[PDB]
Design a protein around this ligand. Structure first.
Ligand SMILES: Nc1ncnc2c1ncn2[C@@H]1O[C@H](COP(=O)(O)OP(=O)(O)OP(O)(O)=S)[C@@H](O)[C@H]1O
Ligand SMILES: [Mg+2]
Lengths: 65, 279, 286
């Protein structure tokens, strides 16, 4: 009875959102405000804001009541 | 997140007929209570709807001039609270003048816009005694508003999905050379969509995408390829067809919206004042 | 009302809790903002390791919240000298805590009040994150946060240095502290002041350099400390295996971006390694 990791499977009812670590490589971060050094010191990156914006954009897009 | 939110599960309805049924039920229940308690004194459901539209406009104007400046999320949350409350309640039982202020108060608390009661009531255009009286009324109605919302306080607005779609368009849709030119008009359409029942009928992402595509069409720019390839809707034809139908229905909702008229609003306000003073 | 007040559970800062029937009921500015925050966040979350809000109601400004009845909490287990905390028990507690945190962070919410007394245990050994009075959504660039969150003993160095914008690190660091408390049975960094808290953090883990924390000097309340060398982790945790040491090191990285997230922690070798976590029914009952 050993533990194996399993990702959370929550249905979003919308288009796939790119992974957080891939946002910079895919070019999304070129269109979001850069995190200030003070922001980065506390652990806040522009990737977080971009990822949340994309997730909210795609959440429930294909859902009908 | 919207996809497992209380708004999606309990406050996104199947059709305008369901909303009309709920409002008619509320009006009928209040009429029955008044009949069993103690005529042209009663407001008709369409008259209630006209009054609700007028007082939602008043809530918008109240939030526009509010100091300190309200974030747009707070305003959207307050408007959602107003709509949801009057889905199941009659303006003859609870005056929308107090209810809209209570909605703004609760939205300020919920969306973490920290303001104190004195500065909240200083924004009301009244003498001091009026401000304290309004504050007491808001305090009395806060719990009732929370109860009538079924304790579902988190509201998902189309503003963040709109920004996310703008990011995605700037990243993956180079045909639209500068998506920022779509902003202003799209925002305009968003506001118009906010005046209808679409917020009770469609997801925030659908509303934001509809506003963006309406702005693009108004500018003579065609963007079906964004849906087809970028959003991968070529792998599911029925998904794309349903999304297009949803957008068309939302645009039709915007088209058939009729703003309240000043003379009718004055007559209905006199009727509502009479109904409240008679109770 | 429908619920009958069975027993008096305890008092609290913002409310009074009673066991009822088996649930727990928690009783000019209007309705208290802490209760509103708890209601608004718990209505939108549904996970086995997050306390469930079954009902809410009240009168005037007074409101009652109905939660699942929780038999005990992790602080009671830690302070119970009669209870022996095996590696399997610690792994099980850590696993449940991290699963709950992974869900919460996936929904863009920071708990900001993690500590053993806020991790409740039910009769069946299921651990649940509770006390969401400080919890707040994150990820919005145009929202300002406060650095005076998390109990001082569990507060991250970035918060102690006054960071106004932060992410999951403020929870993960606290998680590390909790793990340390599970291994030593005493608070890891019991500072009596913010300065003393930072001093203890640096005397234990070493004063961080710009190599380990690239923008550390930019924080509004940053002050310079002496260059402590720090104690090696295996000195502090003698019985901890190498995988557990790796997890502890990941949780206590000074750079909040490099600090491991809940998902990364869950994927670490320590959780998949032998022995497996204890089942909930076999967890120590105080
Ligand atoms: N679901 C529950 N089941 C059993 N006991 C609970 C439950 N919830 C809270 N308590 C108890 O109530 C105590 C008071 O803490 P809470 O009411 O949860 O939070 P609080 O109002 O901020 O008070 P403090 O400062 O954290 S002690 C807890 O420490 C538990 O003993
Ligand atoms: Mg507590």
């Amino acid at each position: 009875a050993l533990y194996e990791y399993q990702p959370l499977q929550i249905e979003t009812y919308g288009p796939h959102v790119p992974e957080l670590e891939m946002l910079g490589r895919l070019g999304y971060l070129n269109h979001v405000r850069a995190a200030s050094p003070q922001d980065l010191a506390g652990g806040y990156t522009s990737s977080l804001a971009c990822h949340r914006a994309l997730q909210d954009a795609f959440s429930g897009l294909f859902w009908q009541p | 997140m919207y996809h497992n939110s209380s708004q999606k599960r309990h406050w996104t309805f199947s059709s305008e007929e369901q909303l009309a049924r709920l409002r008619a039920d509320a009006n009928r229940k209040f009429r029955c209570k008044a009949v069993a308690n103690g005529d042209p004194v009663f407001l008709e459901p369409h008259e209630e709807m006209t009054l609700c539209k007028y007082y939602e406009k008043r809530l918008l104007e109240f939030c526009s001039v509010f100091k300190p400046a309200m974030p747009r999320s707070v305003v959207g949350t307050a408007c959602m609270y107003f709509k949801r409350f009057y889905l199941n309640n009659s303006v003859m039982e609870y005056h929308p003048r107090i209810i809209m202020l209570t909605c703004a108060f609760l939205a300020c608390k919920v969306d973490e816009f920290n303001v104190s009661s004195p500065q909240f009531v200083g924004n009301l255009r009244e003498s001091p005694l009026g401000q304290e009286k309004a504050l007491e009324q808001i305090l009395e109605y806060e719990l009732l508003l929370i109860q009538q919302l079924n304790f579902h306080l988190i509201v998902h607005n189309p503003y963040r999905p709109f920004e996310g779609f703008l990011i995605d368009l700037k990243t993956r849709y180079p045909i639209l050379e500068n998506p920022e030119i779509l902003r202003k008009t799209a925002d305009d359409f968003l506001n118009r969509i906010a005046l209808t029942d679409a917020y009770l009928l469609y997801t925030p992402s659908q509303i934001a995408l509809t506003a963006i595509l309406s702005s693009a069409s108004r500018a003579g720019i065609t963007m079906e390829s964004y849906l087809s390839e970028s959003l991968m809707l070529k792998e599911n034809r029925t998904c794309l067809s349903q999304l297009l139908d949803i957008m068309k229905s939302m645009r039709n909702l915007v088209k058939k919206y009729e703003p309240p008229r000043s003379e009718e609003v004055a007559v209905l306000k006199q009727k509502l004042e009479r109904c409240h003073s008679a109770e | 009302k429908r619920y009958e007040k069975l027993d008096f559970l305890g008092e609290g800062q913002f409310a009074t809790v009673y066991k009822a029937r088996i649930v727990a009921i928690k009783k000019k500015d209007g309705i208290n903002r802490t209760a509103l925050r708890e209601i608004k966040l718990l209505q939108e979350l549904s996970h086995p390791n997050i306390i469930g809000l079954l009902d809410a109601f009240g009168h005037k400004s007074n409101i009652s919240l109905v939660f699942d009845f929780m038999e005990t909490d992790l602080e009671v287990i830690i302070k119970d000298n009669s209870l022996v905390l095996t590696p399997s028990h610690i792994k099980a507690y850590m696993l449940m805590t991290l699963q709950g945190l992974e869900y919460l962070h996936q929904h863009w919410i920071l708990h900001r009040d993690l500590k053993p007394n806020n991790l409740l245990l039910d009769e069946n050994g299921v651990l649940k994150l509770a006390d969401f009075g400080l919890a707040k959504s994150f990820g919005s660039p145009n929202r300002a946060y406060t650095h005076q969150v998390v109990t001082r003993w569990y507060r991250a160095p970035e918060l102690l240095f006054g960071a106004r914008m932060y992410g999951v690190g403020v929870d993960m660091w606290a998680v590390g502290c909790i793990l340390a408390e599970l291994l030593l049975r005493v608070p890891f960094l019991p500072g009596d002041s913010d300065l003393d808290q930072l001093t203890r953090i640096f005397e234990t883990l070493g004063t961080p350099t710009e190599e380990q924390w690239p923008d550390m000097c930019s924080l509004p309340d940053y002050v310079t400390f002496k260059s402590f060398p720090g104690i090696p982790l295996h000195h502090i945790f003698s019985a901890a295996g190498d995988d557990l040491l790796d997890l502890i090191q990941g949780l206590f990285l000074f750079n909040p971006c490099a600090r491991i997230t809940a998902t990364q922690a869950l994927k670490m070798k320590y959780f998949s390694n032998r022995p497996g976590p204890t089942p909930g029914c076999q967890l120590p009952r105080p």
